[PDB]
Each structure stands twice: as C-alpha cells, then as structure tokens.
Short mmCIF file of C-alpha atoms and ligand atoms in Angstrom, two decimals:
data_model
loop_
_atom_site.label_atom_id
_atom_site.label_comp_id
_atom_site.label_asym_id
_atom_site.label_seq_id
_atom_site.Cartn_x
_atom_site.Cartn_y
_atom_site.Cartn_z
CA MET A 13 138.05 112.00 68.42
CA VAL A 14 140.09 115.12 70.68
CA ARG A 15 139.02 118.68 70.16
CA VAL A 16 139.56 121.26 73.03
CA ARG A 17 139.97 125.50 72.64
CA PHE A 18 141.22 128.86 74.08
CA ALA A 19 138.76 131.10 74.08
CA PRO A 20 139.94 134.67 75.20
CA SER A 21 138.62 137.51 75.30
CA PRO A 22 140.65 139.95 73.63
CA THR A 23 141.85 142.73 75.59
CA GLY A 24 145.13 143.45 74.12
CA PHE A 25 147.26 141.86 75.97
CA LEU A 26 148.33 138.38 77.27
CA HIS A 27 148.31 137.51 80.82
CA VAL A 28 150.06 134.63 82.26
CA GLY A 29 146.80 133.14 83.47
CA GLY A 30 146.21 133.02 79.69
CA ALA A 31 149.03 132.59 78.36
CA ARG A 32 149.10 129.20 80.30
CA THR A 33 145.87 127.94 79.82
CA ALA A 34 146.03 127.91 75.62
CA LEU A 35 149.34 125.70 76.94
CA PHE A 36 147.63 123.57 78.62
CA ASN A 37 145.38 122.80 75.62
CA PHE A 38 147.84 122.48 72.83
CA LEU A 39 150.30 120.33 74.72
CA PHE A 40 147.52 118.04 75.14
CA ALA A 41 145.56 118.68 71.69
CA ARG A 42 149.37 117.36 70.69
CA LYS A 43 150.05 114.85 72.72
CA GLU A 44 146.42 112.93 71.48
CA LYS A 45 147.12 114.24 68.21
CA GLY A 46 143.56 116.40 68.64
CA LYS A 47 142.53 119.30 67.39
CA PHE A 48 143.05 122.70 68.60
CA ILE A 49 141.11 125.40 68.75
CA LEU A 50 141.27 129.32 68.42
CA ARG A 51 137.75 131.09 69.63
CA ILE A 52 137.87 135.02 69.83
CA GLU A 53 135.38 136.31 72.58
CA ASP A 54 134.60 140.10 70.52
CA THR A 55 131.34 140.61 71.06
CA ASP A 56 131.44 143.55 73.23
CA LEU A 57 134.35 144.42 70.84
CA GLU A 58 133.71 147.16 67.99
CA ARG A 59 135.24 145.98 64.24
CA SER A 60 138.05 148.85 65.30
CA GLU A 61 139.36 147.18 68.53
CA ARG A 62 140.07 144.39 65.93
CA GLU A 63 144.13 144.83 66.86
CA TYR A 64 143.48 143.05 70.81
CA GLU A 65 143.09 139.89 68.03
CA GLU A 66 146.07 140.76 66.06
CA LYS A 67 148.27 141.45 68.86
CA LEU A 68 147.17 138.05 71.34
CA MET A 69 147.25 136.19 68.49
CA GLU A 70 150.92 137.67 67.25
CA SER A 71 152.01 136.65 71.76
CA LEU A 72 150.27 132.84 71.44
CA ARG A 73 152.89 132.42 67.79
CA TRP A 74 155.21 134.06 69.63
CA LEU A 75 154.63 131.49 72.44
CA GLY A 76 154.39 128.78 69.77
CA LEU A 77 151.10 127.06 70.85
CA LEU A 78 149.92 127.41 66.92
CA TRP A 79 146.01 126.56 66.47
CA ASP A 80 144.09 124.27 63.67
CA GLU A 81 141.08 126.16 63.30
CA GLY A 82 140.85 129.68 64.02
CA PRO A 83 139.82 133.30 62.57
CA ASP A 84 142.59 133.10 60.56
CA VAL A 85 143.57 129.60 59.98
CA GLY A 86 139.43 129.31 59.48
CA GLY A 87 138.09 125.31 59.96
CA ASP A 88 134.65 122.94 59.63
CA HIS A 89 133.24 124.42 62.77
CA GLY A 90 133.14 128.50 62.00
CA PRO A 91 133.39 131.43 62.08
CA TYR A 92 135.70 131.71 64.96
CA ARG A 93 134.24 135.09 66.43
CA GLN A 94 131.55 135.62 68.58
CA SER A 95 131.13 139.12 66.92
CA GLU A 96 130.06 137.02 63.78
CA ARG A 97 127.52 134.00 65.28
CA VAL A 98 124.83 136.78 66.54
CA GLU A 99 122.42 135.39 64.71
CA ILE A 100 123.32 131.47 66.35
CA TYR A 101 122.99 132.06 69.36
CA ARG A 102 119.52 133.85 68.95
CA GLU A 103 118.21 131.21 67.09
CA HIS A 104 119.39 129.36 70.20
CA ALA A 105 117.78 131.28 72.92
CA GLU A 106 114.65 131.60 70.60
CA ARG A 107 114.47 128.04 70.75
CA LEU A 108 115.06 127.24 74.60
CA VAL A 109 111.87 130.03 74.68
CA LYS A 110 109.32 128.31 72.39
CA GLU A 111 110.76 124.89 74.38
CA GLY A 112 109.47 127.20 77.65
CA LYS A 113 112.75 126.74 79.00
CA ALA A 114 112.71 130.24 78.68
CA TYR A 115 111.28 133.62 78.68
CA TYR A 116 111.46 136.92 77.36
CA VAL A 117 111.75 140.08 79.97
CA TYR A 118 111.36 144.35 79.15
CA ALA A 119 113.38 145.70 82.33
CA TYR A 120 115.87 148.25 81.83
CA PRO A 121 119.79 147.09 82.99
CA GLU A 122 119.67 149.80 85.36
CA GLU A 123 117.03 148.48 87.24
CA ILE A 124 117.36 144.69 87.77
CA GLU A 125 120.70 145.92 89.47
CA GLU A 126 118.43 148.55 91.76
CA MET A 127 115.40 144.87 92.82
CA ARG A 128 119.25 143.17 93.15
CA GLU A 129 119.62 145.88 96.05
CA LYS A 130 116.30 145.06 97.64
CA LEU A 131 116.27 141.73 97.79
CA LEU A 132 119.26 141.95 99.62
CA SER A 133 118.84 144.60 102.04
CA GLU A 134 115.70 142.73 102.71
CA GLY A 135 117.59 139.35 103.86
CA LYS A 136 116.34 137.53 100.76
CA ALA A 137 118.47 136.13 98.08
CA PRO A 138 119.41 137.11 95.34
CA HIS A 139 117.62 134.65 92.91
CA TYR A 140 115.21 136.53 90.15
CA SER A 141 112.12 134.09 89.55
CA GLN A 142 109.64 134.99 86.20
CA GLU A 143 106.82 136.24 87.38
CA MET A 144 109.57 139.41 89.07
CA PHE A 145 109.48 140.64 85.58
CA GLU A 146 105.80 140.34 84.49
CA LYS A 147 105.63 144.20 85.80
CA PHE A 148 107.72 145.73 83.00
CA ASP A 149 106.33 143.69 80.50
CA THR A 150 103.81 146.89 79.88
CA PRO A 151 102.99 148.12 76.53
CA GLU A 152 104.42 151.58 77.34
CA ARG A 153 107.89 149.53 77.55
CA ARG A 154 107.31 147.31 75.01
CA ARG A 155 106.50 150.43 72.67
CA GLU A 156 110.20 152.48 73.92
CA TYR A 157 112.22 149.45 73.73
CA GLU A 158 110.85 149.67 69.76
CA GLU A 159 111.57 152.72 69.21
CA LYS A 160 115.10 152.80 70.63
CA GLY A 161 116.18 149.95 68.77
CA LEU A 162 116.00 147.71 71.67
CA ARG A 163 114.74 144.06 72.28
CA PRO A 164 113.65 141.96 75.31
CA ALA A 165 116.38 140.12 77.02
CA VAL A 166 115.98 136.51 77.21
CA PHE A 167 116.12 134.68 81.06
CA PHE A 168 116.52 130.75 81.21
CA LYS A 169 114.38 129.13 83.33
CA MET A 170 117.02 127.40 85.88
CA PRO A 171 115.47 123.86 87.14
CA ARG A 172 115.23 123.64 90.58
CA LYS A 173 117.87 120.47 90.80
CA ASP A 174 120.64 119.13 91.61
CA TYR A 175 124.11 119.06 88.85
CA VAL A 176 127.19 117.03 89.35
CA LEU A 177 130.44 118.13 87.84
CA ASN A 178 132.88 115.36 87.41
CA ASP A 179 136.18 117.68 87.16
CA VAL A 180 138.97 115.73 86.02
CA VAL A 181 141.59 118.31 88.43
CA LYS A 182 138.48 119.58 91.16
CA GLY A 183 137.13 115.62 90.98
CA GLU A 184 132.87 115.73 92.08
CA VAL A 185 131.63 118.94 92.61
CA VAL A 186 127.95 119.15 93.93
CA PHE A 187 125.80 122.12 93.05
CA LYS A 188 123.15 121.94 95.13
CA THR A 189 119.47 122.87 94.20
CA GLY A 190 118.33 126.30 95.04
CA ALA A 191 121.78 127.74 94.59
CA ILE A 192 121.62 130.48 92.29
CA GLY A 193 117.84 131.39 90.11
CA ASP A 194 117.02 132.48 86.83
CA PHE A 195 119.80 134.51 84.47
CA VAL A 196 120.44 136.32 81.77
CA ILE A 197 121.36 134.35 78.04
CA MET A 198 120.65 137.10 75.75
CA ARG A 199 121.15 140.89 76.09
CA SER A 200 118.26 143.97 75.49
CA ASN A 201 120.97 144.67 72.74
CA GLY A 202 121.14 141.48 71.08
CA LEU A 203 124.43 140.04 72.55
CA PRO A 204 124.51 136.99 74.00
CA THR A 205 125.86 136.28 77.46
CA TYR A 206 129.41 135.32 78.24
CA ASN A 207 128.14 131.67 79.37
CA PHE A 208 125.17 131.14 76.55
CA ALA A 209 128.01 131.82 73.72
CA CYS A 210 129.51 129.30 75.91
CA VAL A 211 128.09 126.07 75.52
CA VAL A 212 125.70 126.95 72.15
CA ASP A 213 129.91 127.42 71.02
CA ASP A 214 131.37 124.36 73.14
CA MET A 215 128.41 121.81 71.57
CA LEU A 216 129.00 123.48 67.65
CA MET A 217 132.12 123.63 67.66
CA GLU A 218 132.14 119.98 68.85
CA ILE A 219 134.37 120.55 71.83
CA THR A 220 135.33 116.75 73.39
CA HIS A 221 137.44 118.51 76.80
CA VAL A 222 137.17 122.52 78.71
CA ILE A 223 140.26 123.02 80.33
CA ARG A 224 140.01 126.21 80.94
CA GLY A 225 141.07 128.12 84.82
CA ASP A 226 138.96 127.64 87.73
CA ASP A 227 137.75 130.85 88.55
CA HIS A 228 135.08 129.08 85.70
CA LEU A 229 134.04 126.96 87.54
CA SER A 230 130.89 129.02 89.24
CA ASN A 231 130.00 129.18 85.36
CA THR A 232 129.62 125.50 85.22
CA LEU A 233 126.42 125.03 87.25
CA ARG A 234 124.79 127.55 84.54
CA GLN A 235 126.71 125.49 81.50
CA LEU A 236 125.78 122.34 82.95
CA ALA A 237 121.44 123.78 82.75
CA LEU A 238 122.02 125.12 79.39
CA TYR A 239 123.50 121.31 78.17
CA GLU A 240 120.85 119.52 79.45
CA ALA A 241 118.12 122.48 78.56
CA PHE A 242 119.61 121.69 74.64
CA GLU A 243 119.78 117.37 75.83
CA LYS A 244 123.42 117.25 74.79
CA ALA A 245 125.98 115.49 76.56
CA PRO A 246 127.77 118.29 78.22
CA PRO A 247 132.36 117.98 77.23
CA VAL A 248 134.90 116.90 79.48
CA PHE A 249 135.60 119.51 82.35
CA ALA A 250 138.92 120.13 83.89
CA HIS A 251 139.49 123.24 85.81
CA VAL A 252 143.23 124.84 86.68
CA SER A 253 144.62 126.42 89.43
CA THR A 254 144.56 130.02 90.12
CA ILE A 255 147.54 131.74 89.65
CA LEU A 256 149.14 133.60 93.01
CA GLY A 257 152.17 135.88 93.48
CA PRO A 258 154.90 135.31 95.39
CA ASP A 259 152.57 137.06 98.87
CA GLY A 260 149.74 134.14 97.93
CA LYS A 261 147.39 137.24 97.43
CA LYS A 262 146.50 136.49 93.70
CA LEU A 263 148.65 137.89 90.69
CA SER A 264 148.17 141.77 89.58
CA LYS A 265 150.21 144.79 88.84
CA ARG A 266 151.80 144.87 92.57
CA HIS A 267 153.28 141.26 91.74
CA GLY A 268 155.27 143.02 88.99
CA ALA A 269 154.98 142.15 85.13
CA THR A 270 151.81 140.48 84.47
CA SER A 271 151.81 140.42 80.26
CA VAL A 272 153.30 138.65 77.95
CA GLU A 273 153.71 141.65 75.97
CA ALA A 274 155.86 143.07 78.75
CA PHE A 275 158.48 140.47 79.06
CA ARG A 276 159.12 140.33 75.66
CA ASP A 277 159.86 143.47 75.77
CA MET A 278 162.44 143.17 79.43
CA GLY A 279 163.97 140.59 76.91
CA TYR A 280 162.46 136.90 78.18
CA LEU A 281 162.77 134.38 75.52
CA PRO A 282 159.58 131.64 74.20
CA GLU A 283 161.17 127.94 76.02
CA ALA A 284 161.84 129.53 79.56
CA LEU A 285 158.26 131.34 79.64
CA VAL A 286 156.53 128.23 78.21
CA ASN A 287 158.23 126.00 80.43
CA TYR A 288 157.63 127.54 83.40
CA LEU A 289 154.20 128.74 82.73
CA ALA A 290 153.48 124.59 82.15
CA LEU A 291 154.59 124.05 85.63
CA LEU A 292 151.82 126.79 86.86
CA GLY A 293 149.44 123.96 87.61
CA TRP A 294 150.60 120.72 86.80
CA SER A 295 154.18 118.82 87.04
CA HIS A 296 156.62 116.64 85.58
CA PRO A 297 156.44 112.81 87.41
CA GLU A 298 159.61 112.56 88.55
CA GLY A 299 159.32 116.52 89.45
CA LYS A 300 162.12 117.63 86.18
CA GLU A 301 161.72 121.44 85.78
CA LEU A 302 163.96 121.67 83.07
CA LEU A 303 162.04 120.73 79.27
CA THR A 304 161.96 121.48 76.24
CA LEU A 305 158.64 121.54 74.70
CA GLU A 306 158.93 118.28 72.44
CA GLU A 307 159.52 116.83 76.72
CA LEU A 308 156.17 119.06 78.01
CA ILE A 309 154.62 116.83 75.47
CA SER A 310 155.75 113.34 75.99
CA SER A 311 155.12 114.58 79.92
CA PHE A 312 152.00 116.45 80.42
CA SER A 313 148.37 114.68 81.22
CA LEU A 314 145.51 115.75 82.65
CA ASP A 315 145.50 113.39 85.28
CA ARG A 316 149.00 115.29 87.30
CA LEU A 317 146.67 118.83 87.17
CA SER A 318 146.98 120.18 90.44
CA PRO A 319 143.72 121.17 92.14
CA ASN A 320 145.59 123.14 94.54
CA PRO A 321 147.21 126.96 93.83
CA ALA A 322 150.17 127.50 91.52
CA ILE A 323 152.57 130.59 93.11
CA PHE A 324 154.02 132.73 90.72
CA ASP A 325 158.19 132.82 91.31
CA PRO A 326 159.42 135.63 89.39
CA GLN A 327 163.32 134.36 90.59
CA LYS A 328 163.03 131.00 89.45
CA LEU A 329 161.57 132.37 86.01
CA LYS A 330 164.08 134.86 85.22
CA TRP A 331 166.85 132.36 86.14
CA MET A 332 165.74 129.44 83.77
CA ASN A 333 165.19 132.48 81.83
CA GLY A 334 169.07 132.74 81.96
CA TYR A 335 169.40 128.74 81.58
CA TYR A 336 167.58 129.07 77.62
CA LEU A 337 169.62 132.28 77.10
CA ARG A 338 173.34 130.72 77.48
CA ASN A 339 172.71 126.86 76.07
CA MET A 340 170.35 128.46 72.90
CA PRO A 341 172.65 128.49 69.87
CA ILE A 342 174.74 131.62 69.11
CA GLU A 343 173.50 132.46 65.57
CA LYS A 344 169.55 132.75 67.60
CA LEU A 345 171.02 134.02 70.17
CA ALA A 346 172.71 137.70 68.54
CA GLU A 347 169.21 137.90 65.86
CA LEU A 348 167.37 138.37 69.50
CA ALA A 349 169.97 139.89 71.50
CA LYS A 350 170.86 142.52 68.17
CA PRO A 351 167.80 145.12 68.86
CA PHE A 352 168.24 145.60 72.33
CA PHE A 353 171.88 146.98 71.33
CA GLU A 354 170.23 148.62 68.94
CA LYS A 355 168.10 150.17 71.35
CA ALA A 356 170.60 151.16 73.63
CA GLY A 357 172.10 152.88 71.61
CA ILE A 358 174.85 150.59 70.81
CA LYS A 359 175.81 150.54 67.09
CA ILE A 360 176.13 146.48 66.09
CA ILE A 361 177.96 146.12 61.73
CA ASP A 362 180.23 143.07 62.64
CA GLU A 363 178.51 139.96 62.99
CA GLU A 364 181.48 138.25 64.05
CA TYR A 365 182.62 140.21 66.08
CA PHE A 366 179.60 140.43 68.07
CA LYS A 367 178.58 136.69 68.57
CA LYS A 368 182.44 136.75 70.43
CA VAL A 369 181.13 139.06 72.92
CA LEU A 370 177.96 137.77 73.58
CA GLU A 371 179.46 134.53 73.80
CA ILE A 372 181.70 135.65 76.93
CA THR A 373 178.78 138.02 78.56
CA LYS A 374 176.03 135.74 78.53
CA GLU A 375 176.65 134.18 81.63
CA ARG A 376 176.44 137.62 83.35
CA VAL A 377 172.98 138.41 81.92
CA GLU A 378 169.39 136.73 82.05
CA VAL A 379 167.97 138.18 80.54
CA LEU A 380 167.89 139.85 76.76
CA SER A 381 167.70 143.89 78.13
CA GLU A 382 170.45 143.21 80.35
CA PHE A 383 172.90 142.39 77.55
CA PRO A 384 174.19 146.43 76.27
CA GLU A 385 175.44 147.79 80.04
CA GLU A 386 177.15 144.97 80.28
CA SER A 387 179.21 144.19 77.13
CA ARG A 388 179.11 148.29 76.57
CA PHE A 389 182.52 148.29 77.42
CA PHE A 390 183.17 145.75 74.16
CA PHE A 391 182.09 148.55 72.05
CA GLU A 392 182.96 152.44 73.41
CA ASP A 393 186.29 153.26 74.95
CA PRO A 394 185.57 153.77 79.00
CA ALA A 395 185.32 156.36 80.90
CA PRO A 396 190.09 157.20 81.70
CA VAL A 397 190.93 156.29 85.24
CA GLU A 398 193.88 157.82 87.26
CA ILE A 399 196.76 155.24 86.94
CA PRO A 400 198.48 155.60 89.93
CA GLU A 401 202.54 156.67 90.75
CA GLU A 402 203.80 153.08 90.81
CA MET A 403 202.32 151.80 87.40
CA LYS A 404 202.52 154.88 84.99
CA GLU A 405 206.25 154.05 83.82
CA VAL A 406 205.12 150.18 83.73
CA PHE A 407 201.89 150.69 81.73
CA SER A 408 203.80 153.44 79.32
CA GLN A 409 205.97 150.45 79.13
CA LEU A 410 203.44 147.49 77.92
CA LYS A 411 202.62 150.20 74.54
CA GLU A 412 206.57 149.10 73.44
CA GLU A 413 206.82 145.56 75.04
CA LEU A 414 203.03 144.28 72.87
CA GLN A 415 203.54 145.91 69.20
CA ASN A 416 205.43 142.98 68.46
CA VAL A 417 203.60 140.09 69.92
CA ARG A 418 201.24 137.72 69.00
CA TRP A 419 197.79 138.43 70.32
CA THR A 420 197.06 135.78 72.27
CA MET A 421 197.50 135.70 76.43
CA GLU A 422 199.63 132.59 75.70
CA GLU A 423 202.49 135.50 74.38
CA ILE A 424 200.32 138.37 76.20
CA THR A 425 200.86 137.17 80.13
CA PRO A 426 205.08 136.24 80.33
CA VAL A 427 205.22 140.25 78.87
CA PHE A 428 203.15 141.05 81.60
CA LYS A 429 204.80 139.02 84.42
CA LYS A 430 207.97 140.61 83.05
CA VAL A 431 207.36 143.77 83.16
CA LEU A 432 205.92 143.61 86.77
CA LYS A 433 208.74 142.19 88.03
CA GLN A 434 211.34 144.00 86.02
CA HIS A 435 209.77 147.02 88.39
CA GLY A 436 209.05 145.02 92.00
CA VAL A 437 204.63 146.32 90.83
CA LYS A 438 202.13 143.15 92.55
CA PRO A 439 200.23 141.60 90.23
CA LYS A 440 197.26 142.05 92.45
CA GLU A 441 197.01 145.54 91.41
CA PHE A 442 198.13 145.94 87.81
CA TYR A 443 195.44 143.53 87.02
CA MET A 444 192.11 145.40 89.58
CA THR A 445 193.99 148.78 87.50
CA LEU A 446 193.67 146.90 83.86
CA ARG A 447 189.98 146.52 84.38
CA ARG A 448 189.15 149.55 84.75
CA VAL A 449 191.44 151.20 81.91
CA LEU A 450 189.74 148.50 79.84
CA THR A 451 186.15 148.02 81.37
CA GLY A 452 186.04 150.61 83.60
CA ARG A 453 184.31 149.15 85.98
CA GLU A 454 184.62 147.08 89.35
CA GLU A 455 183.98 143.26 88.02
CA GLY A 456 183.85 141.32 84.31
CA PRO A 457 184.74 138.39 82.78
CA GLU A 458 188.37 137.12 83.25
CA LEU A 459 190.12 139.27 81.86
CA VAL A 460 192.45 136.79 79.88
CA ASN A 461 188.74 136.33 77.71
CA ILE A 462 188.07 140.41 77.69
CA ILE A 463 191.76 141.61 76.13
CA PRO A 464 191.96 138.59 73.14
CA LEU A 465 188.34 139.60 72.20
CA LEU A 466 189.60 143.26 72.25
CA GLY A 467 192.15 144.43 69.50
CA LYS A 468 195.57 145.47 70.32
CA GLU A 469 195.22 148.76 69.15
CA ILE A 470 191.92 148.75 70.93
CA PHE A 471 193.41 147.53 74.44
CA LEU A 472 197.50 149.78 73.87
CA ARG A 473 194.65 152.61 72.81
CA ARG A 474 192.41 152.86 76.17
CA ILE A 475 195.99 152.34 78.06
CA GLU A 476 197.83 155.83 76.75
CA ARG A 477 193.82 157.13 77.49
CA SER A 478 193.53 156.50 80.74
CA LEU A 479 197.00 158.45 81.20
CA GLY A 480 199.04 160.25 79.41
CL1 CL B 1 136.00 129.47 79.13
CL1 CL B 2 119.59 142.74 80.22
CL1 CL B 3 190.21 141.38 88.16
#
C-alpha cells in the first residue's frame, strides 16, 4: 500500500542532505508500515567504484536507516542498481520512439552545447526541437557513430501544455506551457539520463510516495511529462527543505563538516545526528526537539514538512550530541569511546576503571574525540609543578597521615583540614596547588571525584614527584 525510496548517486561520502532525505523516507515507511527501497544511481560509476555504494550503505546502517529492498537485501522489484537496468531503459525509450513521443539524434555532446550558446547569444530560448537535429542526420555521421561504437541519443518530444504538480510540501506548482523544450532521455553512450531512469524505476518499483530535496522540483516537470507519455498516474510528491549553512548560503565545505563520515570520525553519535537530521525540514506538533527514534516514527508526518529552508546549526548539533553522550548507558559509552583513547596513545586494559573515568569526565565533553585530552590525567601522571614554599611541609606530611586511611573523601577530607589548620595554611591555595599536582591543569572535574578514583599510591606518588 505504501512504498518509498532513497535514490542516491554514491560519491563515497553521505552528506547531511542525503542522510536527512533517507531518514524522512525511513520514518514514513516505518510509520505507515510500508516498504523503504534503496536504489543505487550508479549509471556513470565503473565496476571498480562499487566501494562508494559500500560506504553509503555502511553510513545508513550506522545512522540506523535500514531498508527493506536494495542491492544487497534483494526484493521482488529488482534489480536495485541502475547500471544493471540499462536494457530496461532502452526497451522503454524505443517504445516512446515507436509511439511518436520521442526520436533519435546524431549530434555530439560537444555540439548541441555549441547551438545552446548560439541560441543564447541570439536572444532565443534554449529549447530544442526535432527539426534542429536533422543537420546531423547524414550517412557519414551514422557511419562515424557505428565505427566509434556510439548509438544515437534519444530525445523526448516535450508537449506544448501546462503541467500542475500537487506537491505535499510545496502545494500547487504550475509548470506553464513553453517552460522547457525537448530533452535527452538516452545518451549516445547507451546510458539513460537521471530523469528518464527515475521515472522508469518509480513506475516499475511501484513507488507510491517520492520524498526528496526541493532541488529536484524543476526536474519534476520533465518527469510528469514522461509519466503522461507512459499513461501511468504519477506518485505522490513531497519536496523537502534546502539545508542552508548558519549564514544563509547553501550548506558547503566552508561551513565545516558536511559528511556523515566526518561526524563519525570527530566522535558524534547516530542518535544525535538522526534526531538533528529530523529537525532539518520538519517539526514536532508541540515543538519538541529531543526525540528518540521511536518518538520520531510516531510523531512524523508529511503535513508537518516545511516549505521553507532549514538552517544548519553546528552548536545545536554538538550540544544535542553531548545530551545523548551523557544519558547513554555506560557499557555502550565505553565501547564507543575506547578507540578514541587508543588513537590518542592512551592504552585501556582495566575496564572497570575506564567506565568510572568516563562517568566523571562525560559532563565536560560534547563529542567522543574530546575524552582523551580531558581524561588524560586519570591514566598518565602529569608534568611536575613547583609546590610553593609555605606548603612544601604540608604536602610532605600527607604521605605519613594518609598511609593508614580508607581511601574515601569522608576519611581523606578531615585529614586535609587537620594538617592545613595545624600548619596555618588557607584551604583555597591548597586545593588549587593540589589540582596542579594531580591534574596538571587549572580546571577539571570536582576534586572530591578525582581523588578517590585515583589510587592511594597514585595520589601520593604525584605529590612526591611534583616537588621533593
Ligand atoms: Cl530523486
Ligand atoms: Cl548525447
Ligand atoms: Cl579547585
């Protein structure tokens, strides 16, 4: 009853816009209990470049946007790669030509681009017609195409009529007669164009709803004409928001990390990204932003898709990441954090100690790559700081006092108070110097939490090492 698809052209990196579009299809499919199809637009890719498809699928599974039908999982409406469907598109292109709805063209791609510019220089519209290509239909050119392994490109006769798109998000989009001209549906190298392959697959795969970025709205005119050519009712269209950077301009390189792979490498969580990606072109009825994946599926709907653009907020994504990172189960937070420590040179053998070190320091990190430098003092002894003159005697006495004591603040704190009062040393300056002895920094977690986690041996060793 309900069938949606994500149709990416794999480049190796799944960007935020793609990830967002795949999420909206996933949520809709899950809510309505329909199917979510993955279609790889690998027409121009080589056999060697299948690793881009492997990386895009990996990133979708990392985000948890699992699909029902696809190149690996299979399905009754396959194959799911456009490279493997070349004969299906050819079969459909020739059918339009036989019905007088399309036609063959023998002009090169280096040419056409010449007459494109000739029409523009002459003030005319850049709209193609069948009579414009008759110049190139000569026996010499047909021989040159045969001898060079080329086929004539198939062009679609664009009819002189109005097309009305009743979009779910954008509403009524009138494409007035004489907007565009004739266009290429099959190229001279035997491969299809995006629009033609898109329509043939949307029909054959029985797509009910096409949810995609609004940058494909112009292309919908070319697709609606093709649906009419094949005499098949088109699917429901939902054109989602354009993702802009924080300054208003289109999201890009200059705005920071743009790929799902880049966020994973920096240390972002899938639940954080998915929740944030959900907010780029949709809102919860009551404006709720911290939603679980179950909450998104339940609350999501096509009537709440914004017709306006989504502005990317890196601070909000990073803050939202910190939220999930702190409320995540410690068992899971440990396995996700461990590689960042190993990459940073800190080796982790004690699993119980590691969970305790992360439980304290998690309140100070928003991203997983921040953990190693923040929690470094808990593993490696810091640089020895010069203990001031009046306290040298106080710090040296602590080795003796704290030797026969249970290693807990309830027993350690009264010993500090006794020695400080006895010597006539103010506590503010003692606790400041003690931080520098144990941590080697001006700030960090509460000293009450740091001291007990480190051993008695680790506490005393750092005092004597700092000055002696
Ligand atoms: Cl698409
Ligand atoms: Cl061509
Ligand atoms: Cl302090």
